[PDB]
Paper text:
Here, we present several cryo-EM structures of the mitochondrial RNase Z complex (ELAC2/SDR5C1/TRMT10C) bound to different maturation states of mitochondrial tRNAHis, showing the molecular basis for tRNA-substrate selection and catalysis. TRMT10C is a purine N1-methyltransferase that acts at position 9 of mt-tRNAs using S-adenosylmethionine (SAM) as a co-substrate.
Overall, the structure of the TRMT10C/SDR5C1/mt-tRNA platform did not change with the introduction of the H548A mutation. This may be attributed to the absence of the first Zn2+ ion due to the H548A mutation. The scissile bond is followed by the mt-tRNASer(AGY) acceptor stem. Taken together, in comparison with the RNase Z-HS product structure, the RNase ZH548A-HS structure reveals additional ELAC2 residues involved in binding to the mt-tRNA precursor and in orienting the scissile bond, namely E130, K700, and G156-P157.
Residue numbers in the entry:
A (entry chain F): 92 to 164, 175 to 385
B (entry chain A), C (entry chain B), D (entry chain C), E (entry chain D): 7 to 261
Write the structure that this text describes.
């Protein structure tokens, strides 16, 4: 590719540019069809190396630090096998959740509204969100609805989980949540809903739209809910928090941690602990 | 040996019961498939040849099992082995405080009816048929093999109805063996673990995969032909009586 | 301690249930005697004072138990302990070749209906009432104690129906304990041996004194008061859950 | 009641043994802490007052136990209750293919020496001491309580030696109860699950929370005081003989 | 099938071990009689043809078993099956008040060493030899069969030492099955009761002829060939793992 015609002086020009690039990275560079977009991507691609080597340099510096102390310097009940035992324990709990647990739906029908940066970030929040469900005392039955098998979102999920994808204790499906559940019990959670969520209802299916629009697109989740006949609710952030800073649309890992706290009889004081403290000045 | 014996297999149209009939017939025995009319056991009976027939009967009905046993006695002249494999299950918690659902009484009743009394309904009726048999050299008239589950020992969440019925089979195994000891009838119970049967297949595929991997060794679902092998071993061993044999691959079910 | 606790004892008009109520009420608790209308529980409830009330109900019917628990809620405001002492027995061989007599299916179903179905029916409805209670400092909402004699393990000749019912209670003790673990309800099972219940004192002195001498130590029939003592011990111990406790004086029933 | 009784508690300087001594002395009984000289038994016996004394002895040595039993007779005049809480734990895989490591035989022998052999050494010697007692109104001469573990039923990976020693205690509890029944001595066994002994509390907080979460209910490690409560209940209840009681909060250990 | 398998039979010079070797060699397998030098195993090995060899070794000695296992490696190349049948017994009671006799400590130690420690000594050493085998189509490297006794559950009077060692084998059969699960080795336990062994001929004939009538059915002493048949059944069934199989003819041992 001739796209090297930009990089090979942009390094000499004085802008921050990474030294190691591949054709796969080079391909995504040419979709950036403006000077600022290319500069923004190159800045991201440059800082990837910057924290890599800095953390790289840290780790073998530690290797010398421990190898000198490790080489120079009884009755037990259990073998030290806890990480294996914890994973098995969460597996049994997840298997029980898939049968009797309350369903929670992550709507994957937002692939067409996301750029590559946003789509990748959605998976990262999805990975953390499902991780917190596993470690909970009373896990949800997590559903991935509207997830196209060949779609971009599915391929990214497979790449991140690798072998674990086929072994996850969650129900991923092509069908919409309206096909799996009665339309009366579905409550599409969205920040733009005019109805404020008062109490957590254990006989309802809460739908979270897996949409991370860093280029914020208000009303997208509400439009989907009103395109169907689904009811909507919004978190009582204004009721219990003194907001000052930032968007009121929380991340997927914060949302699931708020719902999990509510499901475990926690009040709104404990549940809203997971709203970033940088966005408000205390609970009232 | 097993050749020449007549075996009445309840729920023999599918699952563990069908695998037992395939092995026993293949070994030279004669089998009668006792299952519901809509279970499709007629096709299976024709597939196994002239040595296997299908008796449409419901184990929970006294008259139905009597018709089946008369059919077995008419076709083959005698009954030598009874294998109780017919069973159902439900997935329902005793009480779900969050959702406010209580386990219904009909679900508990129907599981108890099919799994527990229907097993006892067969045992008392066929023991009369075995009671007509002349003793062999060891003084034995027949062998009754029941099917409990590991749920009778470590039941899972939502398995209360299933565990109560299978637990009952374990409880009455020894008393029935003592009851029929005068007349030379052995009563044995098998407690299979996770097996490739439609009862466990109804679970989600990802739940089945996790459960299969949790079996210490072999790390797979129990193949039904391995259940049939254990049944043949119990039939051929004269000293096995009044005992519950766990066939689960050393798995212990967590809640 | 048990002072202030409200206990619903099924079959509390006689036998083990009555002994449990006398101890619990004598220790400062309140007891709701749940038994048959003709069992004479009203006379027993009057003798035990104002802290004990009689609720006539048949455990086999969901309607009667619901009204009985509504009476327990009305009189004392809450339910803390459920003691399932209600039970019947039948002595009949599975099959008698010398007599051509077969165990009656109605007899087998009748024993299961009261011993097994009635116990679960009480458990599933009582768990709804303990679910309304606020967890205490230890997070406990209630205790359920079931009765299932040693016949569940080593039943005697002609005890197939009784062992099947008691084997069911033992088998389902753990799955129910896992079911109610999120709620905070402990489910425990007691396996009494030969006790001086009005049933055992009815049979002639020949079998009465012989069986009392068959207990290794103490060589006597179990005092129902000793059953009540172990019932109270389970209530007071927070860490007893999902376990079957044999209270028999180490006797193993021979055929 | 337990007031006036004399209790010999092996391994009574810490853990379950110390908790049993604290409750029995508090309830009005006298205790003898039978533990190793290097343990803090002398400080513990002083803390419990003049009703508790420390007898240094190794349960694996016949001579050491006899001197301890002589001390109990000298100080208090008689022996009423023996509690066998002394024991060690060793975690070691039977064979590790990747590491080429085989379980060491000396590891197996030492666990069997203290847990299994040590328990029986106390039992055979303390039984003779209770054989000198005049029977009470019930004809009883003493109570012997052994401490098995849940590993005797579901041992985890690496607990081959520990489970074998604890499984043997479950094995001997009924035959010994039969041996001592003519004498009038009851033998019982308690199988604690995960308890807050110094062995478990020394573990990192990360794994301590996990072990607490594995218990169905209550979701916490067993309080040693709860073990003491069940020990008292066995002593007071005359009809508990030859039975293993699991005190584990319905936990079933995973591999 | 068992054809071509190499089995190391512990204590195979008489009783259950000799019967197991007799059946396996007849079916086409190879056997190694691991017994004491004075047991007369060389005559048994010669009588069984070139497929059977004698390895004189004490199960309590690590050196003796390693040489015996190396002999099997030299003669046959691999070890596929291990059957632990060697065991001794003692009839001393725990304590005799009338005679002032206490169970001597060495009798308990000697029985424990041969039965419990000896079984584990063979298990851990044969696990290394089985770990060298290539996993078969089912991923299995070998099968280890242990011989407990019915005394592990309902041991009689004067069987405290025997029940302890046999209870230990039952206790550790699951952790070892869990320990060896990643390798691909199945551990199963047989619990025979009253078999026609030399052990059941040392006792007085009138007592022995009385026990033969105590078995409900078959009302006789167990044929060692029946034990050999069950061992072959366990070998050929891939899903039998971690379970104790009672082979007693439904007998429950009275005090
Ligand atoms: N304050 C809030 N109350 C309820 N749900 C919220 C919320 N903030 C975010 N969410 C949920 O978290 C998900 C990602 S926030 C993105 C929402 C979407 N881009 C929009 O503009 O409407 C959404 O599906 C939404 O349902």
């Amino acid at each position: 590719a001739a796209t090297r015609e930009f990089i090979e002086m942009w390094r000499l020009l004085g802008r921050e540019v990474p030294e190691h690039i591949t054709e796969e990275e080079l391909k995504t560079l040419m979709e950036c069809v403006s000077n600022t977009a290319k500069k923004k991507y190159l800045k991201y691609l440059y800082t990837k190396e910057k924290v890599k080597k800095a953390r790289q340099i840290k780790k073998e510096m530690k290797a010398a630090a421990r190898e000198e102390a490790k080489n120079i310097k009884k009755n037990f009940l259990f073998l030290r096998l806890w990480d294996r035992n914890m994973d098995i324990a969460m597996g049994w709990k997840g298997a029980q959740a898939m049968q009797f647990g309350q369903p929670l739906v992550f709507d994957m029908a937002y692939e067409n509204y996301m750029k590559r940066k946003e789509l990748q970030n959605t998976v990262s929040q999805l990975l953390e969100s499902e991780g917190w469900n596993r470690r909970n005392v009373d896990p949800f039955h997590i559903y991935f609805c509207n997830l196209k098998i060949d779609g971009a979102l599915h391929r990214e999920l497979v790449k991140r989980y690798q072998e674990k994808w086929d072994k996850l204790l969650l129900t991923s499906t092509e069908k919409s949540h309206v096909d799996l559940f009665p339309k009366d019990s579905i409550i599409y959670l969205t920040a733009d809903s005019p109805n404020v969520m008062t109490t957590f209802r254990h006989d309802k299916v809460y739908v979270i739209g897996s949409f991370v629009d860093k280029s914020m697109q208000p009303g997208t989740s509400l439009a989907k809910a009103k395109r169907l006949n689904l009811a909507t609710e919004c978190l009582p952030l204004d009721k219990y928090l003194q907001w000052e800073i930032g968007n009121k649309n929380l991340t997927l890992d914060q949302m699931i941690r708020i719902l999990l706290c509510l499901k475990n009889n926690g009040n709104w004081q404990e549940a809203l602990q997971f709203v970033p403290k940088r966005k408000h000045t205390g609970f009232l | 040996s097993v050749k020449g014996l007549v075996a009445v297999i309840t729920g023999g149209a599918s699952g563990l019961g069908l695998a037992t009939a395939e092995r026993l017939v293949g070994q030279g025995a004669s089998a009668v498939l006792l299952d519901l009319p809509n279970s499709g056991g007629e096709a299976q009976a024709k597939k196994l040849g002239n040595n296997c027939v299908f008796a449409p009967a419901d184990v929970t009905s006294e008259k139905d099992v009597q018709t089946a046993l008369a059919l077995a006695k008419g076709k083959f002249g005698r009954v030598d082995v009874a294998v109780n494999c017919a069973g159902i299950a439900v997935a329902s918690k005793t009480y779900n405080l969050k959702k406010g659902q209580t386990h219904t009484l009909e679900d508990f009743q129907r599981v108890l009816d099919v799994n527990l009394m229907g097993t006892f309904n067969v045992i008392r009726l066929v023991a009369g048929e075995m009671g007509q048999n002349e003793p062999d050299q060891g003084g034995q008239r027949g062998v009754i093999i029941n099917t409990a589950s590991v749920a009778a020992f470590e039941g899972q969440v939502g398995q209360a109805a299933y565990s109560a019925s299978k637990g009952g089979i374990v409880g009455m195994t020894l008393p029935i063996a003592r009851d029929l000891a005068p007349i030379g009838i052995r009563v044995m119970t098998i407690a299979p673990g996770l097996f490739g049967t439609p009862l466990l297949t109804s679970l989600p595929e990802k739940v089945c995969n996790f459960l299969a991997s949790q079996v210490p060794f072999p790390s797979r679902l129990g193949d039904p032909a391995e259940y049939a092998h254990l049944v043949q071993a119990i039939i051929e061993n004269p000293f096995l009586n009044g005992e519950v044999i766990r066939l689960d691959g050393a798995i212990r079910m967590q809640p």
